[PDB]
């Protein structure tokens, strides 16, 4: 029975 | 501060130092929280020429600032990743990984994220051109901690992008040769390296038990018991996401967190003021009192059903419906004495109250928990007892008024009980 910080980021200034 | 018109008139410029500062000027535009005009600079056809000056090796300022403008493209849509990608930015940044200039292998380092930080195919396109290698070669020292600290944590959170998303999950033979590198990050001691290894150490162990193992075997659990007692939320955050992916795992791997020491950090999991971690310990609990009844034991002796009862009593509701689920899983696989236990605790009627809930699912469970602890009591003679109980805390008013319930498996349930056993 068991059940089981951001993609991408820009560079800003700077 | 220029318009897009003038960038592309200095980038078309048969001028290197003219499209150096057209170059660096499209960076300022792109570098500005506002909207910067991604979609214009991808219009006025500026990748191509963009991603030919990431090779111009005797103008390591045009490198630097091309790089840059892609990072922050890249950094957009699908769409805005894509067109980085389709302009052939994926070998020319990997070029970049052995370049003598840090800030400039930095920003190769930060771009390659922004792709394999857009899914899967791209992840799995960016390590088919080769950029574990010099990725990890950047960490080939004796001692992480002569490295400039944003230079690491700019690293580590690519290599995390390396080992996210699922369908399907990294190749088998990149996350063994990411994994010893990611072991020594994870006991590395700046906070944003150690958060985002503990991120990429959950989404490997966010799959099948066989990708748990990998990790696993690497003794990895008590360094991640040690973190989940971190004061920093962001670390906190990522180790017990990791610790409940592995309790998904088997028996055994279950085991390794038990022994390393995680059930005595649960009181204050269990209370956490954070509903998210609340609700993940409790997920967490619900796994591992799935276990062997020696494990279910273990969380008896760490005194952890009262730390069940709070949480059935008062709790934000998904915490309340992760908390029915440990119980119901419990009172399927403890022992006779490990059920009358978890009612000597006080564990019915917070039940009973949860049966008011306007969610399908919680009352089935917790229908199911019932059935299970009538079964332990008929074992010893007790059903009438136990009959009471629930009736003098109200229990018998929300079983019968279940019946008047639509959906089959409620009301079967509840008849089945409602005659059984009153």
């Not at chain 2, 410029?13 to 979609?39: C, G, V, Y």
């Not at chain 2, 390591?60 to 302009?87: C, H, M, R, Y």
């Not at chain 2, 990429?200 to 075997?217: C, F, H, Q, W």
Request: charged share 20%; glycine share 6%.
């Amino acid at each position: 029975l068991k059940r089981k910080l951001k993609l991408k980021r820009a560079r800003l200034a700077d | 501060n220029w318009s897009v018109e003038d960038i592309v008139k200095g980038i078309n410029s048969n001028n290197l130092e003219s499209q150096l500062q057209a170059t660096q000027a499209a960076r300022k535009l792109l570098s500005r929280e506002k909207q910067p005009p991604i979609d214009n600079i991808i219009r006025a056809g500026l990748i191509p020429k963009f991603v030919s000056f990431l090779g111009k090796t005797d103008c390591s300022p045009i490198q630097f600032e091309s790089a840059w403008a892609l990072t922050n493209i890249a950094s957009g849509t699908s769409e805005q990743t894509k067109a980085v990608v389709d302009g052939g930015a994926i070998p020319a940044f990997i070029s970049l990984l052995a370049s003598p200039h840090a800030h400039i292998s930095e920003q190769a380092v930060w771009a390659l994220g922004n792709i394999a930080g857009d899914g899967s195919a791209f992840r799995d396109l960016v390590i088919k051109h080769g950029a574990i290698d010099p990725l990890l070669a950047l960490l080939a020292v004796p001692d992480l901690s002569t490295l400039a600290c944003g230079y690491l944590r700019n690293l580590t959170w690519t290599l995390s992008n390396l080992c996210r998303n699922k369908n399907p999950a990294p190749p088998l033979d990149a996350v063994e040769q990411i994994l010893p590198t990611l072991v020594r990050l994870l006991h590395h001691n700046d906070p944003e390296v150690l958060a985002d290894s503990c991120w990429a150490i959950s989404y490997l162990t966010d799959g099948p038990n066989e990708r748990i193992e990998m990790v696993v075997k690497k003794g990895v659990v008590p360094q991640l018991v040690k973190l989940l007692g971190a004061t920093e939320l962001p670390i906190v955050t990522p180790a017990l996401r990791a610790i409940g992916n592995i309790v998904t795992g088997t028996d055994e791997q279950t085991q390794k967190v038990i022994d390393a020491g995680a059930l005595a950090v649960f009181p204050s999991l269990l209370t956490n003021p954070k509903t998210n971690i609340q609700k993940e310990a409790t997920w967490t609990m619900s796994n591992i009192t799935a276990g062997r009844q020696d494990q279910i034991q273990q969380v008896v002796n760490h005194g952890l059903v009262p730390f069940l009862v709070g949480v059935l009593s008062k709790a934000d509701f998904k915490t309340q419906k992760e908390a029915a689920w440990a119980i119901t899983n419990y009172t399927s696989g403890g022992t006779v004495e490990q059920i009358v236990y978890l009612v000597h605790c006080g564990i019915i009627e917070p039940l009973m109250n949860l049966l008011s809930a306007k969610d399908t699912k919680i009352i089935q469970v917790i229908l199911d928990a019932i059935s299970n602890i009538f079964q332990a009591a008929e074992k010893l003679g007790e059903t009438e007892k136990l009959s009471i109980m629930i009736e003098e805390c109200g229990g018998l008013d929300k079983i019968e008024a279940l019946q008047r319930h639509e959906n089959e498996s409620v009301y079967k349930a509840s008849l089945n009980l409602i005659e059984k056993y009153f």
